[PDB]
Amino acid sequence: DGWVKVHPTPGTMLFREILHGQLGYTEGQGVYNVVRSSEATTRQLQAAIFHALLNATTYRDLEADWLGHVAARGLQPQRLVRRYRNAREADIAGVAERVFDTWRNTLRTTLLDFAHGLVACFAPGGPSGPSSFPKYIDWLTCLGLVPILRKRQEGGVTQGLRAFLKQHPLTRQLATVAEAAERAGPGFFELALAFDSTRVADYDRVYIYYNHRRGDWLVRDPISGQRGECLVLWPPLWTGDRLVFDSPVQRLFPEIVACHSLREHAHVCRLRNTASVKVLLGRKYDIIDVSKSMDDDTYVANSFQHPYIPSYAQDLERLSRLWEHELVRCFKILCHRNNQGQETSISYSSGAIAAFVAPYFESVLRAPRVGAPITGSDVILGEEELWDAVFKKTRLQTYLTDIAALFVADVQHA
Amino acid sequence: DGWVKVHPTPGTMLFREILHGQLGYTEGQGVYNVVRSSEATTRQLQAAIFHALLNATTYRDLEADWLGHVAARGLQPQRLVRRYRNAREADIAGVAERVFDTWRNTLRTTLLDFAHGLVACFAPGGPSGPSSFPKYIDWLTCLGLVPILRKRQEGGVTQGLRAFLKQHPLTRQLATVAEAAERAGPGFFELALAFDSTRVADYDRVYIYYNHRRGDWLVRDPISGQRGECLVLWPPLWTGDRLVFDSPVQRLFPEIVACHSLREHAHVCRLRNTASVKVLLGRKYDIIDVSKSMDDDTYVANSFQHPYIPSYAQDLERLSRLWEHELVRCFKILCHRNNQGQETSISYSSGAIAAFVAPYFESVLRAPRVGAPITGSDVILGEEELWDAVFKKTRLQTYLTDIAALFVADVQHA
Amino acid sequence: YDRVYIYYNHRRGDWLVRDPISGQRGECLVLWPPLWTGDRLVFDSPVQRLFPEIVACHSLREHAHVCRLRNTASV
Numbered sequence: 001d002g003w004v005k006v007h008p009t010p011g012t013m014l015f016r017e018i019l020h021g022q023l024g025y026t027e028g029q030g031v032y033n034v035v036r037s038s039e040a041t042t043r044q045l046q047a048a049i050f051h052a053l054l055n056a057t058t059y060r061d062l063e064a065d066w067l068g069h070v071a072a073r074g075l076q077p078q079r080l081v082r083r084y085r086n087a088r089e090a091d092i093a094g095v096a097e098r099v100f101d102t103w104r105n106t107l108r109t110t111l112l113d114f115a116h117g118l119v120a121c122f123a124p125g126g127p128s129g130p131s132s133f134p135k136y137i138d139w140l141t142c143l144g145l146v147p148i149l150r151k152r153q154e155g156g157v158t159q160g161l162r163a164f165l166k167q168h169p170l171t172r173q174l175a176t177v178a179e180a181a182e183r184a185g186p187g188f189f190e191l192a193l194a195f196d197s198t199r200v201a202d203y204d205r206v207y208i209y210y211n212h213r214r215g216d217w218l219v220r221d222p223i224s225g226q227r228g229e230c231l232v233l234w235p236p237l238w239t240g241d242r243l244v245f246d247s248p249v250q251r252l253f254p255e256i257v258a259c260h261s262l263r264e265h266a267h268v269c270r271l272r273n274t275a276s277v278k279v280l281l282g283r284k285y286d287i288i289d290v291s292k293s294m295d296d297d298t299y300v301a302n303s304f305q306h307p308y309i310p311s312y313a314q315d316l317e318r319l320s321r322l323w324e325h326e327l328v329r330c331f332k333i334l335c336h337r338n339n340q341g342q343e344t345s346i347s348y349s350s351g352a353i354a355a356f357v358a359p360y361f362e363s364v365l366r367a368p369r370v371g372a373p374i375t376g377s378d379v380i381l382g383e384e385e386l387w388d389a390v391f392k393k394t395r396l397q398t399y400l401t402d403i404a405a406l407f408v409a410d411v412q413h414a
Numbered sequence: 415d416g417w418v419k420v421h422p423t424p425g426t427m428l429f430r431e432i433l434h435g436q437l438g439y440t441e442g443q444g445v446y447n448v449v450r451s452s453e454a455t456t457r458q459l460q461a462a463i464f465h466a467l468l469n470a471t472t473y474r475d476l477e478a479d480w481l482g483h484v485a486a487r488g489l490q491p492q493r494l495v496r497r498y499r500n501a502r503e504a505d506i507a508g509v510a511e512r513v514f515d516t517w518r519n520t521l522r523t524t525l526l527d528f529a530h531g532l533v534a535c536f537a538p539g540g541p542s543g544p545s546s547f548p549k550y551i552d553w554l555t556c557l558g559l560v561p562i563l564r565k566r567q568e569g570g571v572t573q574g575l576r577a578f579l580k581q582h583p584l585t586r587q588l589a590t591v592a593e594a595a596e597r598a599g600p601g602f603f604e605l606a607l608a609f610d611s612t613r614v615a616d617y618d619r620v621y622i623y624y625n626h627r628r629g630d631w632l633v634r635d636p637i638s639g640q641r642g643e644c645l646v647l648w649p650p651l652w653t654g655d656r657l658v659f660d661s662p663v664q665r666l667f668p669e670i671v672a673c674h675s676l677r678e679h680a681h682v683c684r685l686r687n688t689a690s691v692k693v694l695l696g697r698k699y700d701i702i703d704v705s706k707s708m709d710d711d712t713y714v715a716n717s718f719q720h721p722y723i724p725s726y727a728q729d730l731e732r733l734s735r736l737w738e739h740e741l742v743r744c745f746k747i748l749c750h751r752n753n754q755g756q757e758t759s760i761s762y763s764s765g766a767i768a769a770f771v772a773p774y775f776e777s778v779l780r781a782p783r784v785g786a787p788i789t790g791s792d793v794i795l796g797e798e799e800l801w802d803a804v805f806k807k808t809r810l811q812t813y814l815t816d817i818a819a820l821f822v823a824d825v826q827h828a
Numbered sequence: 829y830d831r832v833y834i835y836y837n838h839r840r841g842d843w844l845v846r847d848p849i850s851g852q853r854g855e856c857l858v859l860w861p862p863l864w865t866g867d868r869l870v871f872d873s874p875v876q877r878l879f880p881e882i883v884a885c886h887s888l889r890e891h892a893h894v895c896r897l898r899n900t901a902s903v
Binding site: 016017020021023024025026027031033039042086099106109116120124134202203205223267271273274276277280281282283284290291300307309338341342345383 | 664687708777
């Protein structure tokens with residue numbers, strides 16, 4: 001009733017084949033490899049987890065832990081001052097600030113270890129398997145659509161979380177991390193459930209049907225008999241006779257076809273010209289041409305030779321430049337070049353992550369709030385740098401300084 | 415029932431051949447050699463072992479050892495101050511600082527020697543043989559798969575560890591070293607067991623089967639009859655007739671074939687052209703072309719000479735550049751180049767380790783914990799620099815400074 | 829180099845090195861392993877990689893010399 005088949009057509013198969021370089025290849029196309037990188041997704045995962053865990057810190061809990069450690073070490077400031085029998089403010093101030101600094105950086109290391117354990121638990125299920133990011137990105141590149149199949153289930157990620165959190169010894173030693181983990185735990189459980197639920201359709205096993213009268217989609221798995229959903233970022237066009245996509249491969253398609261045809265014709269012409277001497281036969285290493293087959297009351301009046309051979313270097317170079325420029329502009333990639341003109345590194349710009357990573361989470365993953373998205377510089381840096389940067393600004397440092405200021409000032413003012 | 419062979423087909427054998435330069439070779443392909451480097455894995459082992467050793471330190475045990483050394487040297491602050499008979503606190507402060515600093519660097523030398531022995535114990539078995547890193551890399555490059563055969567058994571690595579730890583007299587001298595080694599012992603045994611258990615399949619024997627109807631793999635050893643696991647990083651695609659892999663060699667395949675065919679055609683055309691003078695005969699150093707063989711009731715009309723010779727400089731240069739660019743972008747390698755654009759060294763970037771080294775440990779080797787991944791700068795630096803860097807920021811330095819300041823206060827008030 | 833004898837087996841994958849004259853049995857160590865492709869063996873040494881190009885270059889030089897010698901005549 002107005003429906004038409006879309007995906008199993010050979011056109012999309014040819015698109016995917018040209019993505020793998022089945023015909024033609026240029027170094028400009030090589031920039032596509034960084035477009036499939038999962039660095040941004042992992043950065044977003046760890047930043048969101050860091051924000052979630054650290055915002056659960058309690059001022060009272062950390063004050064209780066600090067006073068418990070103080071009692072355990074017996075470092076009562078009045079007792080230390082009386083034992084030292086001096087009014088040297090600088091000495092006791094240095095001692096107190098150093099002790100608080102050692103407590104703060106041991107807390108930092110413990111929190112870093114626990115967060116690293118959590119993010120390592122979450123890491124494997126992101127890139128490979130369910131919600132595979134490269135599959136989403138090459139779906140958007142090939143056609144501009146992201147088919148999805150949803151099903152509520154318990155997955156291996158939840159099993160890993162369960163096998164991780166309970167037996168972790170850090171809950172027994174540090175109380176504050178225990179309360180922080182337990183109060184936010186259902187959020188991580190829901191995140192794991194969302195990870196399991198979302199499955200991205202495999203390219204060669206999914207069928208897409210579109211109806212043009214009303215403009216609605218239908219996606220189903222021929223083998224599993226499961227109905228899914230269709231998500232579109234930039235919609236296609238329906239001319240009435242053929243559905244015309246608007247993906248970058250669609251735009252690039254005619255030029256690659258022309259270049260490949262030219263290269264094939266050049267090869268065919270080159271193969272013919274292997275001969276050295278040619279002759280002709282007519283009525284009154286070597287190749288003989290015989291016109292006697294078609295001689296019928298005829299006679300040769302003249303003959304000509306023109307050994308053409310096509311050239312294709314500039315066309316390949318232009319195709320490489322076009323590939324590079326299109327892939328740079330479409331995905332808003334960021335390029336770094338030095339004074340002499342040498343390329344140094346390729347990284348995602350802030351626009352790229354804001355335009356692709358965030359909608360991925362909000363629609364393909366259906367994940368809850370992810371907090372403030374990272375900046376373009378953060379993805380370049382390392383995990384420890386991101387951890388320190390987020391730790392400095394956020395809530396925990398304010399409580400830490402709040403404790404430190406009064407704890408220090410009390411002993412010297414006394 | 416839907417199964418089909420994957421590896422024994424001549425395509426993968428041709429891929430492995432083309433890596434070894436069986437056909438064609440260019441300067442760009444040479445950058446593959448630095449990819450197979452084992453420096454990153456060894457640096458990761460060093461960092462992991464250093465972290466696993468240092469965290470086992472005990473503040474009480476370190477204090478006990480320091481006070482025992484002080485008592486052995488008779489460095490009682492009260493007695494030494496009474497002997498000096500002067501009010502110069504600077505002298506006693508400097509003496510205490512120097513003595514504790516020599517204790518510091520003696521502890522550091524002992525720790526680094528023991529750690530170097532331990533890492534040397536794990537050094538040979540890791541990157542080569544069982545769980546050999548270059549085989550993992552060239553499996554990823556050839557196909558995108560990493561066949562694995564697993565078996566739980568004791569290995570020579572554990573034998574070396576056993577020959578090391580209890581035969582090391584360092585435990586009898588320093589209490590802290592013995593206590594830390596005893597605490598961290600089981601983890602190293604688990605690491606050795608993980609090293610021995612994992613075996614990477616060899617290219618010439620193992621067989622892998624695929625089935626698209628349900629998307630499953632089957633890997634087995636034809637001779638030993640052992641069944642294993644099939645790991646995939648970037649999956650392939652099934653287009654009915656064939657299975658187009660998504661490895662870099664697969665992308666590069668058509669261009670190399672075209673270049674090699676052109677070189678062969680150029681050679682065969684060049685060999686023919688060695689003649690200087692050529693003549694032809696017909697019915698009424700030297701080469702004679704007898705057209706009389708087919709000259710029957712036929713008569714010549716004209717003759718031609720077009721001595722073509724193909725050239726291949728441009729294709730070779732482009733292939734070299736394409737090889738270099740593809741290998742640089744695919745594995746996220748990093749280059750260092752100076753003012754005039756000439757390179758000086760090749761390094762293993764942070765993205766490279768984060769995308770290859772870590773999943774290798776987590777899946778191929780099934781390591782329990784690797785700690786915080788190193789930065790891209792650490793692989794450049796030497797072992798001693800890495801040890802010194804990891805020593806400074808960690809718990810043992812905190813304990814060391816805590817002891818130092820309290821001892822300085824005690825000696826200055828004494 | 830010119831004395832030692834090296835034997836290899838493909839089904840089990842083991843080596844055997846012995847001195848033909850002294851009769852002494854030794855030990856075989858490998859850094860990067862070779863490859864077994866049926867009725868052939870392919871090493872992975874740098875010279876092995878460089879081999880297919882040097883042969884072509886030497887053949888080209890030989891053919892150039894052969895052609896040069898012929899053209900010494902004037903008429």
